[PDB]
mmCIF file of C-alpha atoms in Angstrom:
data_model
loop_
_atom_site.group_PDB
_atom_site.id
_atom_site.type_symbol
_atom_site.label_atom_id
_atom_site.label_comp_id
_atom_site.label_asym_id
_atom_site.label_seq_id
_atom_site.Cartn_x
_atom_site.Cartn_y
_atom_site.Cartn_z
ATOM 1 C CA UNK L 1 44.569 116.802 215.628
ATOM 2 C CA UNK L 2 42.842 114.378 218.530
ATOM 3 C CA UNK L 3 42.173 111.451 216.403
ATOM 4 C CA UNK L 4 45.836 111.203 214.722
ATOM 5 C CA UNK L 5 48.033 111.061 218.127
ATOM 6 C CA UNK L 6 45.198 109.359 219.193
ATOM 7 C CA UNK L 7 45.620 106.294 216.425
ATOM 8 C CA UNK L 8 49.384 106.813 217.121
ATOM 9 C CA UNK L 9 48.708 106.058 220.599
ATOM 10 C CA UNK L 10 47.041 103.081 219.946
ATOM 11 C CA UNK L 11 49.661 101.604 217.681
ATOM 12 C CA UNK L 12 52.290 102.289 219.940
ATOM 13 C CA UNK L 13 50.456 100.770 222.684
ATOM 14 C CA UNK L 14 50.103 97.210 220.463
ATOM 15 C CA UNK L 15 53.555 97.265 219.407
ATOM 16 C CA UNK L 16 55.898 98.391 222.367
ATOM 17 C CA UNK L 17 53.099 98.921 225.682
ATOM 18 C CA UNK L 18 52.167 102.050 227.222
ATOM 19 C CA UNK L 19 55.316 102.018 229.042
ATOM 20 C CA UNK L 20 56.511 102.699 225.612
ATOM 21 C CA UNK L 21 54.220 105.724 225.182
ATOM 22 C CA UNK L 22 55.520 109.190 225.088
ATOM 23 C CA UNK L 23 55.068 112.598 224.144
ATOM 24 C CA UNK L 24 58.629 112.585 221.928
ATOM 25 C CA UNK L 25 57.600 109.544 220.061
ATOM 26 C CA UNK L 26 54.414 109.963 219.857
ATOM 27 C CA UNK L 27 55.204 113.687 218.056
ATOM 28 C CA UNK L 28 57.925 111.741 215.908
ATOM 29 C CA UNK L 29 55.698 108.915 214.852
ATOM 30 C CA UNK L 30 53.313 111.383 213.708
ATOM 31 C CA UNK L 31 55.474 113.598 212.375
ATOM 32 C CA UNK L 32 54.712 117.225 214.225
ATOM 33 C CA UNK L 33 56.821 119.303 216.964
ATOM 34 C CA UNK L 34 56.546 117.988 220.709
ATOM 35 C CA UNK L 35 54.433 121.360 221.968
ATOM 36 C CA UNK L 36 51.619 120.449 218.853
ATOM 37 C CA UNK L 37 50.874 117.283 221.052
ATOM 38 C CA UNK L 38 51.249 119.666 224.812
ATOM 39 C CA UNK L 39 47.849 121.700 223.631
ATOM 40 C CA UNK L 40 45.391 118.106 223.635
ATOM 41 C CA UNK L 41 47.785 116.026 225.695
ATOM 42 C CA UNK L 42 50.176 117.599 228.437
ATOM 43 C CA UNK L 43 51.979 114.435 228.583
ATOM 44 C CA UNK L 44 52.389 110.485 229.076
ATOM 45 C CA UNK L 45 49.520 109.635 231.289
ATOM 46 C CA UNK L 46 47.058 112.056 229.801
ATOM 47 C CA UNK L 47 48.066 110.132 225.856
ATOM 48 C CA UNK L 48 47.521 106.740 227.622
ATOM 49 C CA UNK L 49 44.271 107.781 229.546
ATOM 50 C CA UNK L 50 43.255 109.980 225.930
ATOM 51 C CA UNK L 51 43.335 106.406 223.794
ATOM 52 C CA UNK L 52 42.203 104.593 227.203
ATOM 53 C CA UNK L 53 39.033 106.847 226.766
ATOM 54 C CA UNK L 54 38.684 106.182 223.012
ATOM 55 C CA UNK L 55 38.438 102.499 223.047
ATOM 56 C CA UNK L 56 36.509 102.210 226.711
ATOM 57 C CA UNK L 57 33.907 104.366 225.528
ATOM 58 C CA UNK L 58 33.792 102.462 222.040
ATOM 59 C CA UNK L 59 32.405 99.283 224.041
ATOM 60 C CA UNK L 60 28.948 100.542 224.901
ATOM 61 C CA UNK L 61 27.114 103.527 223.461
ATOM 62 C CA UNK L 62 24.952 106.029 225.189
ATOM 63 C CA UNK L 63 21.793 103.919 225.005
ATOM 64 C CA UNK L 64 23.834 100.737 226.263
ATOM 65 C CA UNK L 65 24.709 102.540 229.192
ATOM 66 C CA UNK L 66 21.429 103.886 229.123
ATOM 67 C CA UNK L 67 19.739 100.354 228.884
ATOM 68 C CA UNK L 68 22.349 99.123 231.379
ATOM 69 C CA UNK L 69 20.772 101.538 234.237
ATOM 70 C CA UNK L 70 17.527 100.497 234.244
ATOM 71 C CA UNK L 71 16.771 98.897 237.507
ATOM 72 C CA UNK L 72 13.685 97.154 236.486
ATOM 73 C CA UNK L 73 15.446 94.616 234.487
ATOM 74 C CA UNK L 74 16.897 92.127 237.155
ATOM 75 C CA UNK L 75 20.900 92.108 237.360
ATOM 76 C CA UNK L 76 21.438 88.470 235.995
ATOM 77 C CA UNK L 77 19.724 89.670 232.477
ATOM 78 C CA UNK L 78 21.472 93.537 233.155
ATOM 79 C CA UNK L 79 24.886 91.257 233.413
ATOM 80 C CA UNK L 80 24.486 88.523 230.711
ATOM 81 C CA UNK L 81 23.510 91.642 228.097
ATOM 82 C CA UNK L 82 26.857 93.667 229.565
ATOM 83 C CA UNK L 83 29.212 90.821 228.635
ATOM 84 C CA UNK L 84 27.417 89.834 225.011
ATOM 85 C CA UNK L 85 28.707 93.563 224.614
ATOM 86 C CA UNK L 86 31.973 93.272 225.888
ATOM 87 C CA UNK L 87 32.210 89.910 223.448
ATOM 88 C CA UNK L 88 30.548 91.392 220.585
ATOM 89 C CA UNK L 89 32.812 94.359 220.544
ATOM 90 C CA UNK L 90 35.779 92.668 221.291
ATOM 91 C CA UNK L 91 35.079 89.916 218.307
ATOM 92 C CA UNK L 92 34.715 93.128 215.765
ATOM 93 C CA UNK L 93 37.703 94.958 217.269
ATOM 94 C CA UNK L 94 40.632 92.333 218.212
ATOM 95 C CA UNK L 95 43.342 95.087 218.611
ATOM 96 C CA UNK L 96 41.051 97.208 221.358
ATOM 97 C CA UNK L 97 41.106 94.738 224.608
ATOM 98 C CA UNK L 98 44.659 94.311 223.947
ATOM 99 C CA UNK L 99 44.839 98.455 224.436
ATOM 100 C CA UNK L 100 42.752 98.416 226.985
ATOM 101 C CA UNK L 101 44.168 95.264 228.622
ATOM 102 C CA UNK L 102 47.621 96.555 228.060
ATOM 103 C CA UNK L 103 46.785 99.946 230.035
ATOM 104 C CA UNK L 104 45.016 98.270 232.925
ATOM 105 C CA UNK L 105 48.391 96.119 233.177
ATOM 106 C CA UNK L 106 50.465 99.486 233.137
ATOM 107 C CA UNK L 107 47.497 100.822 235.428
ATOM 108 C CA UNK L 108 31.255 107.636 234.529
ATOM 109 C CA UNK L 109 28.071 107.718 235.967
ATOM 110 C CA UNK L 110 29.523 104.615 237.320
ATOM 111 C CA UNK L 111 26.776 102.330 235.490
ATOM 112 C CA UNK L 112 28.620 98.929 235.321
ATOM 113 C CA UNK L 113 30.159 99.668 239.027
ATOM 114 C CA UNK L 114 27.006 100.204 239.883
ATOM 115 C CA UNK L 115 25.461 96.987 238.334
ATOM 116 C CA UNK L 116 27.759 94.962 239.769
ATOM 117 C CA UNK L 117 27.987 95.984 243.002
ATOM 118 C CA UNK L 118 24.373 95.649 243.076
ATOM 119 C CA UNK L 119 24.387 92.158 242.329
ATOM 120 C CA UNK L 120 26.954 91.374 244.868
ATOM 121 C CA UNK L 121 24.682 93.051 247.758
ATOM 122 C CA UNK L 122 21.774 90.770 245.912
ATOM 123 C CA UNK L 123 23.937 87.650 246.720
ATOM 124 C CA UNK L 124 23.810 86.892 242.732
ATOM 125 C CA UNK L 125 27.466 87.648 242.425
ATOM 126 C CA UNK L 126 29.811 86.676 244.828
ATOM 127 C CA UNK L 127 31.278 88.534 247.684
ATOM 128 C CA UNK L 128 34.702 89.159 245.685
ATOM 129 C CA UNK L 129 36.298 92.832 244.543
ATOM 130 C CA UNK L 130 34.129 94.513 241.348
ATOM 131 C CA UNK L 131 37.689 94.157 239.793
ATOM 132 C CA UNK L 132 37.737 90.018 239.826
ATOM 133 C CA UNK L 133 34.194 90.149 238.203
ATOM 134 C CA UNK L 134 35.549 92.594 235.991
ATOM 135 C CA UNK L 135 38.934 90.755 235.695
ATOM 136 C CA UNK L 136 37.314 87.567 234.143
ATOM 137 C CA UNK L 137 35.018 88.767 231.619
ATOM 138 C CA UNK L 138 37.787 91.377 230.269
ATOM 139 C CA UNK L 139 40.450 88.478 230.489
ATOM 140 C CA UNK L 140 38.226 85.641 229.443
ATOM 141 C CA UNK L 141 37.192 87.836 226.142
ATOM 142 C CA UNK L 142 40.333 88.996 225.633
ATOM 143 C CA UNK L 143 42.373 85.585 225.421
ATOM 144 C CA UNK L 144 39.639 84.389 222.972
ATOM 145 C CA UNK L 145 39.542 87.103 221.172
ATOM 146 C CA UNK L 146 43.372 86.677 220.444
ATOM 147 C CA UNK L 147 43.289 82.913 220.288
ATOM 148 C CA UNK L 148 40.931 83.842 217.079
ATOM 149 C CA UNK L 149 43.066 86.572 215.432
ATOM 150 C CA UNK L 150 46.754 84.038 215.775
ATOM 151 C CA UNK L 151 44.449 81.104 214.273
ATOM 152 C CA UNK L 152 44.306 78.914 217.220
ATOM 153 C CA UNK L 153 40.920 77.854 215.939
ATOM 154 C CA UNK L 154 37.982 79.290 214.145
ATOM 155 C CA UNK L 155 35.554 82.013 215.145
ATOM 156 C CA UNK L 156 32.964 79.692 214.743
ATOM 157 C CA UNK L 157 34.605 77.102 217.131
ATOM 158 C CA UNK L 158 32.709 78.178 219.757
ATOM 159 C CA UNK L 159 29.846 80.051 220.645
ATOM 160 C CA UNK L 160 28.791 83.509 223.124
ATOM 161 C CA UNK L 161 26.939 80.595 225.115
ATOM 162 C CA UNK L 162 29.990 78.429 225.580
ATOM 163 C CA UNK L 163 32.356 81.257 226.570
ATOM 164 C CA UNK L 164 29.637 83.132 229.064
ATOM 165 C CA UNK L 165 29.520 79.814 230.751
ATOM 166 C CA UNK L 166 32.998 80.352 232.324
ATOM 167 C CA UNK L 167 32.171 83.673 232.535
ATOM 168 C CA UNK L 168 29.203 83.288 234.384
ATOM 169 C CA UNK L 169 30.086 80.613 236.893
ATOM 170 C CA UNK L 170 33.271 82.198 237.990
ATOM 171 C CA UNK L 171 30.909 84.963 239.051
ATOM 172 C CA UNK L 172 27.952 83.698 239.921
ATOM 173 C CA UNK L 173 27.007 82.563 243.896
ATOM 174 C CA UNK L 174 27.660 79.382 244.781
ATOM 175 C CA UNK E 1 76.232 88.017 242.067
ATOM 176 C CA UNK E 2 76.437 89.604 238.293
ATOM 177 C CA UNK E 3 74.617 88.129 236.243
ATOM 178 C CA UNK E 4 71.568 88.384 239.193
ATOM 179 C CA UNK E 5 71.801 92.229 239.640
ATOM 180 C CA UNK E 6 71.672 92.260 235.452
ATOM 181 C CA UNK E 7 68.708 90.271 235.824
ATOM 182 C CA UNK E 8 67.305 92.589 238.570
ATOM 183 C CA UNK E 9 67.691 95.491 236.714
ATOM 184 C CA UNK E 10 66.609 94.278 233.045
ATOM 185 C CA UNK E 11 63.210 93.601 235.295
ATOM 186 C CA UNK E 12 63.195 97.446 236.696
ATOM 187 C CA UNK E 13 62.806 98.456 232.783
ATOM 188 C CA UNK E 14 61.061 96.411 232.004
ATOM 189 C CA UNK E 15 58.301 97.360 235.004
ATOM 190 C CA UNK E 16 59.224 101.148 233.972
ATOM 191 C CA UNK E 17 58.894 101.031 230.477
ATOM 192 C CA UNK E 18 58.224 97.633 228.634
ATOM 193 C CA UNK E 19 60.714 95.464 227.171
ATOM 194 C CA UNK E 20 60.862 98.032 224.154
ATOM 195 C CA UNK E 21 63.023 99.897 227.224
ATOM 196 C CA UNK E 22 65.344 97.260 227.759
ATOM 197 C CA UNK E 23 68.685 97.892 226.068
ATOM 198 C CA UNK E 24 72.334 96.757 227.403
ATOM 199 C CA UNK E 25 73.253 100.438 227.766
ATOM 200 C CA UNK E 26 70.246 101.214 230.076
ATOM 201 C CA UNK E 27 71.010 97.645 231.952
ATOM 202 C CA UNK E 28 74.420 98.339 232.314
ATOM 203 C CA UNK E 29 74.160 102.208 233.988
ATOM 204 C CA UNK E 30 71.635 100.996 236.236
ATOM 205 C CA UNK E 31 74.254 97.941 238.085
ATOM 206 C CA UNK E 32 77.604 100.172 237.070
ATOM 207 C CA UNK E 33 79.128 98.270 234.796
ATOM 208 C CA UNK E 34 81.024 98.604 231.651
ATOM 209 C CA UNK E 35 78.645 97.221 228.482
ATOM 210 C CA UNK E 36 81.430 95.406 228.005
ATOM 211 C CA UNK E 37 81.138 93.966 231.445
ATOM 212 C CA UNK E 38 77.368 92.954 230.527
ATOM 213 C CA UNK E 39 78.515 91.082 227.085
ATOM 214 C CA UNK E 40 80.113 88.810 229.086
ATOM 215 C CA UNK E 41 76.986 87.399 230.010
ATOM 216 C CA UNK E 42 74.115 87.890 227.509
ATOM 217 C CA UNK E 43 74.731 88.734 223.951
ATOM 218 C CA UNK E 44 72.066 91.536 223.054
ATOM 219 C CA UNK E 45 68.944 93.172 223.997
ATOM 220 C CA UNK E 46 66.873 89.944 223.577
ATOM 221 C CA UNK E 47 69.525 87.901 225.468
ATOM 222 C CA UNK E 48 68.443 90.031 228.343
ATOM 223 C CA UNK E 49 64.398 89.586 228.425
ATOM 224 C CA UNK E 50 64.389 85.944 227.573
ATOM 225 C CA UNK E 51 67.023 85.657 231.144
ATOM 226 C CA UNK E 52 64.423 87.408 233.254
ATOM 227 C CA UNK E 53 61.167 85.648 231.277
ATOM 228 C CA UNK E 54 62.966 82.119 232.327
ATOM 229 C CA UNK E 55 64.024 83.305 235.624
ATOM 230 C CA UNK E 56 59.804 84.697 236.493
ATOM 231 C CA UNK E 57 58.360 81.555 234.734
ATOM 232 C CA UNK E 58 60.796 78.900 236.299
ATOM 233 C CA UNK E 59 59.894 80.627 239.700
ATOM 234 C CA UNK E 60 56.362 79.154 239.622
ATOM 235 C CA UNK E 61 56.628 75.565 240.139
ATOM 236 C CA UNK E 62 59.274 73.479 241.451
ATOM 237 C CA UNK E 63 60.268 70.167 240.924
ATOM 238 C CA UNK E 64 58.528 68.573 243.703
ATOM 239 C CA UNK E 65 55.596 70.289 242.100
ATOM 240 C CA UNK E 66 56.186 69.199 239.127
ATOM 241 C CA UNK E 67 56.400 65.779 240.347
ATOM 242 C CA UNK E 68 53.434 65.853 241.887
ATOM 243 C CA UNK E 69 51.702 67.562 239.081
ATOM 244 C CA UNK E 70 52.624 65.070 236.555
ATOM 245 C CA UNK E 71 51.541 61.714 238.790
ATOM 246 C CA UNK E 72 49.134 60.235 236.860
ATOM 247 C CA UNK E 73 47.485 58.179 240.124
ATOM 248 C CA UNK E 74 46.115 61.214 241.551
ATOM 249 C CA UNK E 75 43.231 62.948 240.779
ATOM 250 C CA UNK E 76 43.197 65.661 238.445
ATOM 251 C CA UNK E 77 40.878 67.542 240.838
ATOM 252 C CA UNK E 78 43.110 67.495 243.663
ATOM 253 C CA UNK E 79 46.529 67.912 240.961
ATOM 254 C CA UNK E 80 44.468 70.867 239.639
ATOM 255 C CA UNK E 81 43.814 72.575 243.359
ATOM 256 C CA UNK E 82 47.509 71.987 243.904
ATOM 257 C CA UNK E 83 48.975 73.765 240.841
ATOM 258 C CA UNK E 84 46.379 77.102 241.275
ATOM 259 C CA UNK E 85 47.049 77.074 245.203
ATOM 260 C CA UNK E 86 51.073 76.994 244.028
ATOM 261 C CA UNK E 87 50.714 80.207 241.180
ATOM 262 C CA UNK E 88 48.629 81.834 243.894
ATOM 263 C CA UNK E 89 51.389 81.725 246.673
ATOM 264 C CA UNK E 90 53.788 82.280 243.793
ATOM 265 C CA UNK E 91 52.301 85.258 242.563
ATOM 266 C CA UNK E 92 51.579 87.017 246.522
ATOM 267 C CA UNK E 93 55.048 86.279 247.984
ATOM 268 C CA UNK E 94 56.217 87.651 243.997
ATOM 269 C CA UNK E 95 53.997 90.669 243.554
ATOM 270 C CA UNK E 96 55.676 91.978 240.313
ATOM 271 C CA UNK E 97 56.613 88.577 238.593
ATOM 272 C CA UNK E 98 53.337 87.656 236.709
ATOM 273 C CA UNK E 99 53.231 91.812 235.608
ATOM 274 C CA UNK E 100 56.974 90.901 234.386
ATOM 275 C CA UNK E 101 55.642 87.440 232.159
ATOM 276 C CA UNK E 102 53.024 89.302 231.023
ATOM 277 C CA UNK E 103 54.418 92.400 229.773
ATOM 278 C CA UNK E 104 57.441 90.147 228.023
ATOM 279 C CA UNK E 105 54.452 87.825 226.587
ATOM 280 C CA UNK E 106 52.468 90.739 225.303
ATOM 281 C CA UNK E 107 55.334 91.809 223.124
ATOM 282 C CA UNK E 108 56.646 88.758 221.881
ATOM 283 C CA UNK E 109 52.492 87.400 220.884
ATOM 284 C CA UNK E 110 53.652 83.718 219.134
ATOM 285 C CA UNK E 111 52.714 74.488 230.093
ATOM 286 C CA UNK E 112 53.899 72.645 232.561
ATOM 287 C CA UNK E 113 57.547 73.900 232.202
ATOM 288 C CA UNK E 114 60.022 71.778 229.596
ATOM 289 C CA UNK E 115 57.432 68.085 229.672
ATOM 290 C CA UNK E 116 53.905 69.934 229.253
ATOM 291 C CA UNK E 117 53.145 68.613 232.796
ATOM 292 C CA UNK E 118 50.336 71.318 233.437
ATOM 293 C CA UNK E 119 48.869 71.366 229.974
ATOM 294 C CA UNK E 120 48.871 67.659 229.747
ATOM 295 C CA UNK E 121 46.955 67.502 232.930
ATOM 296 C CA UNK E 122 44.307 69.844 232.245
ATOM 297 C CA UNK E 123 43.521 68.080 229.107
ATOM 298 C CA UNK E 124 43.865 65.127 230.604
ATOM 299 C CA UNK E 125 40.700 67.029 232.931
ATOM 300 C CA UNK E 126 39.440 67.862 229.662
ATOM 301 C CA UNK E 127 38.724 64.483 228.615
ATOM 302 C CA UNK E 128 37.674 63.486 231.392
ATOM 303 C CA UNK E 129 35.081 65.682 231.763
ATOM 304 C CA UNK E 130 36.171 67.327 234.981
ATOM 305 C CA UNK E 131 36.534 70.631 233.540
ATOM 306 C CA UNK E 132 35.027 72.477 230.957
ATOM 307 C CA UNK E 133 35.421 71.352 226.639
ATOM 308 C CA UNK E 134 37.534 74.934 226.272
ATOM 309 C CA UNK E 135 40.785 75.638 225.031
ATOM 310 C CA UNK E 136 43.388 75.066 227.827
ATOM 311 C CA UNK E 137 44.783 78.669 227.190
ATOM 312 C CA UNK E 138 41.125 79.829 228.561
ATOM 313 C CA UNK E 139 41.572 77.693 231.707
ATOM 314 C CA UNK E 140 45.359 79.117 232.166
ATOM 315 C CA UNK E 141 44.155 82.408 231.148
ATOM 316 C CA UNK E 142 40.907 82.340 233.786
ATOM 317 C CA UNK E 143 43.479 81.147 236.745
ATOM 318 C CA UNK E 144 46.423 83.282 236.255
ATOM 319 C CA UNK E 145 44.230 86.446 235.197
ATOM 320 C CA UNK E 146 42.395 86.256 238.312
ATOM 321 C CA UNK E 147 45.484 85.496 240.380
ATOM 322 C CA UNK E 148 47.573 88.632 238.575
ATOM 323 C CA UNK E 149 44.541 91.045 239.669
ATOM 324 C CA UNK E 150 44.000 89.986 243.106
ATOM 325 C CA UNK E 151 48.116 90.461 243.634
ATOM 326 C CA UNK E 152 47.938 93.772 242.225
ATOM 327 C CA UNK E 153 45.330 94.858 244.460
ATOM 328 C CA UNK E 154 47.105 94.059 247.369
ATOM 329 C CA UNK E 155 50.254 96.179 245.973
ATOM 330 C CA UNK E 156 47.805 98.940 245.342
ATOM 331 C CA UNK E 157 46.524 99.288 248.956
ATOM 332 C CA UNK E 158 42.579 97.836 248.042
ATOM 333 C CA UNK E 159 42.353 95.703 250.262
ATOM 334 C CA UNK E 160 45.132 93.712 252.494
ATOM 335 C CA UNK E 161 46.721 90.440 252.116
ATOM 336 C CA UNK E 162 44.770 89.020 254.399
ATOM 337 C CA UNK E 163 41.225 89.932 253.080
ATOM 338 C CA UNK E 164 40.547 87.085 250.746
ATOM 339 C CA UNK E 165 41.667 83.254 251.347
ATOM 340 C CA UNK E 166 42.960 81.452 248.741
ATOM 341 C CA UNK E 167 39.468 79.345 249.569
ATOM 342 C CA UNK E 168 37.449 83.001 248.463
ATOM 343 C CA UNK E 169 39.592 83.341 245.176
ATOM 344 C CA UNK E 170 40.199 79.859 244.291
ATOM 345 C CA UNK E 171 36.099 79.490 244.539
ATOM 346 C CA UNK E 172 35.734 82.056 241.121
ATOM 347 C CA UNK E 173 38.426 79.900 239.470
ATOM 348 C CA UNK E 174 37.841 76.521 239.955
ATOM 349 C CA UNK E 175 33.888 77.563 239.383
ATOM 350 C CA UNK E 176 34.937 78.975 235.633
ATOM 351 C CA UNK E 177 36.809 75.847 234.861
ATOM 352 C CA UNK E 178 34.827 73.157 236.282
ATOM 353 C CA UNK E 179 32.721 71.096 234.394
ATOM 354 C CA UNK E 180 29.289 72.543 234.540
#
């Protein structure tokens, strides 16, 4: 019964916030008793971090992270393919930043972590907190991602190139 | 004052459980009033958010801001600095208010206040090809993004107030927008 509190969750999450999220409504919207839900989920932050996990672990695969590890490709390249990632997912799944975004507002090998930090201690990335390099190529996606889906302009308007340009200069050094 | 301490509290629910939480029942037991008391003074539910999303918002920029924003002789470099250096003071001496925007934005999902002051200028940098040919919700969405993170690291004990400069942070933002 994972994947159908799961999607209820999720649609909770778009339509009221995770500070909407809870067990009771979460059973109701459903449509089980409140203890079905206890046995996966033993309450509101373990629902939110459940549907958390679902669409974070959506955004790369195994071999991504995989791929992502490998310190013999520099961290520029390691970076630039990270964020086409984060873009190309995003583009294909409009309603999952907004989760994700949403939770992080309410708010494993540690590959990305990892990545980044490394480039800071490189001097390729500026000397700012992991979560302001995170920050801007979550919330740079994100708002473009939803400027798409309302029909501020087309998804052809612009390209990966001209939206990793921000992207890239806000981290970048220098 | 009334009205304020309804204000207050629609906020507190709003932090606690989303705007979906807001209702004047819940607004009313947390100042100890009658509902009745609270009718006087916004009409429903929505009455309430759309009080505390113009009191956050109108927080941001002041007049003399404003004015200063929308003057046409001065650079749009130096107009620009000004108006990110403003939301950034804003934001750490108001740690929960862009949270509060946010969260009331996110669940609504449809500018230089009233006039367009700060959208006209940054197209106005736009076409002048001082910052970069994106959609101004991009460049609003890059500074206030970065500036909502930043604040609620400091609440969460990463780092102090004191860590950063607005010179350190400001150097990511104006970076993403600038031309180049």
């Amino acid at each position: 019964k994972q994947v159908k509190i799961q999607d209820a969750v999720a649609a909770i999450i778009l339509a009221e916030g995770p500070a909407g999220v809870s067990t009771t409504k979460v059973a109701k919207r459903v449509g089980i008793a409140q203890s079905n839900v206890y046995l996966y989920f033993k309450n509101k932050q373990a629902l939110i971090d459940s549907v958390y996990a679902r669409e974070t672990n959506r955004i790369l695969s195994t071999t991504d992270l995989d791929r992502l590890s490998d310190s013999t490709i520099d961290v520029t390249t390691r970076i630039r393919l990270y964020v086409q990632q984060v873009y190309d997912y995003s583009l294909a799944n409009p309603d999952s930043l907004t989760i994700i975004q949403q939770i992080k507002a309410l708010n494993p090998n540690n590959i990305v972590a990892n990545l980044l930090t490394a480039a800071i201690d490189a001097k390729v990335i500026k000397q700012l907190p992991v979560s302001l390099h995170m920050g801007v190529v979550f919330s740079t996606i994100h708002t473009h991602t939803t400027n798409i889906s309302k029909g501020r302009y087309a998804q052809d308007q612009y390209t990966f190139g001209d939206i990793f340009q921000m992207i890239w200069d806000a981290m970048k050094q220098d």
